[PDB]
Design an enzyme around this catalytic site. Structure first.
Site, mmCIF file in Angstrom:
data_model
loop_
_atom_site.group_PDB
_atom_site.id
_atom_site.type_symbol
_atom_site.label_atom_id
_atom_site.label_comp_id
_atom_site.label_asym_id
_atom_site.label_seq_id
_atom_site.Cartn_x
_atom_site.Cartn_y
_atom_site.Cartn_z
ATOM 1 N N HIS A 157 39.476 31.697 30.938
ATOM 2 C CA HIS A 157 39.862 32.197 32.255
ATOM 3 C C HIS A 157 39.133 33.499 32.578
ATOM 4 O O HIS A 157 38.534 33.644 33.650
ATOM 5 C CB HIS A 157 41.385 32.389 32.301
ATOM 6 C CG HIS A 157 41.893 33.006 33.572
ATOM 7 N ND1 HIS A 157 42.652 32.308 34.490
ATOM 8 C CD2 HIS A 157 41.759 34.258 34.072
ATOM 9 C CE1 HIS A 157 42.955 33.102 35.502
ATOM 10 N NE2 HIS A 157 42.426 34.290 35.273
ATOM 11 N N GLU A 158 39.160 34.458 31.651
ATOM 12 C CA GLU A 158 38.546 35.754 31.922
ATOM 13 C C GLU A 158 37.027 35.647 32.030
ATOM 14 O O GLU A 158 36.424 36.240 32.932
ATOM 15 C CB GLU A 158 38.935 36.765 30.841
ATOM 16 C CG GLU A 158 40.438 37.029 30.699
ATOM 17 C CD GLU A 158 41.133 37.386 32.005
ATOM 18 O OE1 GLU A 158 40.451 37.787 32.971
ATOM 19 O OE2 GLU A 158 42.376 37.271 32.061
ATOM 20 N N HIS A 201 35.766 34.390 35.340
ATOM 21 C CA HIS A 201 35.649 35.381 36.408
ATOM 22 C C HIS A 201 34.229 35.925 36.488
ATOM 23 O O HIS A 201 33.709 36.167 37.583
ATOM 24 C CB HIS A 201 36.635 36.531 36.197
ATOM 25 C CG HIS A 201 38.034 36.220 36.629
ATOM 26 N ND1 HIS A 201 38.339 35.761 37.892
ATOM 27 C CD2 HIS A 201 39.211 36.317 35.969
ATOM 28 C CE1 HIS A 201 39.644 35.582 37.989
ATOM 29 N NE2 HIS A 201 40.197 35.913 36.836
ATOM 30 N N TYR A 226 38.397 38.978 45.897
ATOM 31 C CA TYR A 226 39.647 38.897 45.135
ATOM 32 C C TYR A 226 40.850 39.287 45.995
ATOM 33 O O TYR A 226 41.596 40.221 45.699
ATOM 34 C CB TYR A 226 39.567 39.768 43.887
ATOM 35 C CG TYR A 226 40.493 39.307 42.783
ATOM 36 C CD1 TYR A 226 41.571 40.084 42.374
ATOM 37 C CD2 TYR A 226 40.292 38.085 42.156
ATOM 38 C CE1 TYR A 226 42.419 39.656 41.359
ATOM 39 C CE2 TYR A 226 41.131 37.649 41.148
ATOM 40 C CZ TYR A 226 42.191 38.437 40.751
ATOM 41 O OH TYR A 226 43.024 37.998 39.746
ATOM 42 N N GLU A 267 41.051 32.733 41.344
ATOM 43 C CA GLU A 267 42.007 32.563 40.253
ATOM 44 C C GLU A 267 42.068 31.116 39.783
ATOM 45 O O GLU A 267 42.054 30.842 38.578
ATOM 46 C CB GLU A 267 43.391 33.036 40.699
ATOM 47 C CG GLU A 267 43.673 34.483 40.374
ATOM 48 C CD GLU A 267 43.560 34.766 38.893
ATOM 49 O OE1 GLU A 267 44.230 34.065 38.106
ATOM 50 O OE2 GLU A 267 42.788 35.672 38.515
ATOM 51 N N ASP A 279 50.181 41.192 44.975
ATOM 52 C CA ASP A 279 49.256 40.411 44.157
ATOM 53 C C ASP A 279 47.966 40.126 44.927
ATOM 54 O O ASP A 279 47.437 39.013 44.921
ATOM 55 C CB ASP A 279 49.936 39.122 43.683
ATOM 56 C CG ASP A 279 49.092 38.334 42.712
ATOM 57 O OD1 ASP A 279 48.308 38.956 41.963
ATOM 58 O OD2 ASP A 279 49.223 37.092 42.690
ATOM 59 N N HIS A 318 47.377 35.165 42.375
ATOM 60 C CA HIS A 318 47.955 34.442 41.247
ATOM 61 C C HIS A 318 49.097 33.524 41.661
ATOM 62 O O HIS A 318 49.660 32.836 40.803
ATOM 63 C CB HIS A 318 48.486 35.408 40.180
ATOM 64 C CG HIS A 318 47.434 36.263 39.548
ATOM 65 N ND1 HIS A 318 47.168 37.546 39.972
ATOM 66 C CD2 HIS A 318 46.599 36.029 38.506
ATOM 67 C CE1 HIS A 318 46.205 38.063 39.227
ATOM 68 N NE2 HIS A 318 45.841 37.162 38.332
#
Ligand SMILES: [Ca+2]
Ligand SMILES: [Ca+2]
Ligand SMILES: [Ca+2]
Ligand SMILES: [Ca+2]
Ligand SMILES: [Zn+2]
Length: 316
Positions: free
Chosen positions: A142-143, A146, A157, A166, A226, A231
């Site tokens: 996931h990271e 990005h 974002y 996301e 958020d 998210h």
């Protein structure tokens, strides 16, 4: 650092043993020279100064409790690299084998992980909500995804572009988890979330509403928290991607699944050919339709299923 490539052994956050590519020069460093221009893992020493110090170890064995987050951050970065190279013919996150850098032991009791524009960063968790977050392969992928997004579509974002950003990281974090094929699922973070509670996760792609996230555009969050729900509203796209892959009937709309590989091929192509920094959900649908057409033909099952999936979550 300059040295000679070696192979160490250690234990990850969950106690499993694995071999890791290191580099020897007086010490053994968490530096994997076998992938692109290297995978580098750093010790942030419970502080917030980044990146910290390149992880050094005297004997090339990484079985200490303090070692475990570094072992997994290093190893799962390599798995994620392998996925993008072997499955999508992409060389690291910039497509030109950029060095992949990760810091672990970030801050104290830090219940998160992130890409900071230049590297991955992992907290250890507080032991209650999270254990060290690099223990989750879907979290690691996931990271790193990005970084891929930032170099390709560049989705802002916030709001719908941020929710796509996301979802792309959840989608490919999950496909990397399936690629490594160790207890794969359509959940996010289950391996490092709430050690005291079995069977939960941070988010669900198969049923986003399980954790309060919308599974239909009509339920989208429109406030400002958020970064405008990035998210939260990711659940809408996550559900669509889940449906494209696995099939299902969702609010009465039936989707024929086409499998994980084709999901990955369609969304990777959309991400790298058609999405832009300001793409919204409806533009994602068009990008995915065009990608499926490119790959499989306008009359294919694949194109039809992309359309059914976005219909099912109310994205026109
Ligand atoms: Ca050691
Ligand atoms: Ca799993
Ligand atoms: Ca998972
Ligand atoms: Ca749990
Ligand atoms: Zn993310």
């Amino acid at each position: 650092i300059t040295g000679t490539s070696t192979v160490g052994v250690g234990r990850g956050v969950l106690g499993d043993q694995k071999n890791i590519n290191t580099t020897y020069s007086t010490y053994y460093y968490l530096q994997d020279n076998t992938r692109g221009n290297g995978i580098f893992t750093y010790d942030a020493k419970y502080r917030t100064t980044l990146p910290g110090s390149l992880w050094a170890d005297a004997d090339n064995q990484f079985f200490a409790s303090y070692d475990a987050p570094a072992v997994d951050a290093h190893y799962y970065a390599g798995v994620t690299y392998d996925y993008y190279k072997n499955v999508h013919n992409r060389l690291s996150y910039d497509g030109n084998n950029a060095a992949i850098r990760s810091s672990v032991h970030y801050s104290q009791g830090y219940n998160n992980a992130f890409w900071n524009g230049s590297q991955m960063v992992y907290g250890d968790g507080d032991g209650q909500t999270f254990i060290p977050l690099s223990g989750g392969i879907d979290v690691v992928a996931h990271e790193l995804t990005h970084a891929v997004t930032d170099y390709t579509a560049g989705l802002i974002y916030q709001n719908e572009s941020g929710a796509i950003n996301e979802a792309i990281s959840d989608i490919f974090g999950t496909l990397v988890e399936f690629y490594a094929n160790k207890n794969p699922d359509w959940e996010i973070g289950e391996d490092v979330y709430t050690p005291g509670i079995s069977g939960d996760s941070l988010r669900s792609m198969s049923d986003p509403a399980k954790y309060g996230d919308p599974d239909h555009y009509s339920k989208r969050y429109t406030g400002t928290q958020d970064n405008g729900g990035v998210h939260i509203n990711s659940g809408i796209i996550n559900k669509a991607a889940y449906l494209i892959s696995q099939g299902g009937t969702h609010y009465g709309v039936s989707v024929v699944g086409i499998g994980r590989d084709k999901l990955g091929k369609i969304f990777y192509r959309a991400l790298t050919q058609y999405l832009t920094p300001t793409s919204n959900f409806s533009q994602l649908r068009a990008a995915a339709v065009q990608s499926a057409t490119d790959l499989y033909g306008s009359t294919s099952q694949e194109v039809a299923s992309v359309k059914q999936a976005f219909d099912a979550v109310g994205v026109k």
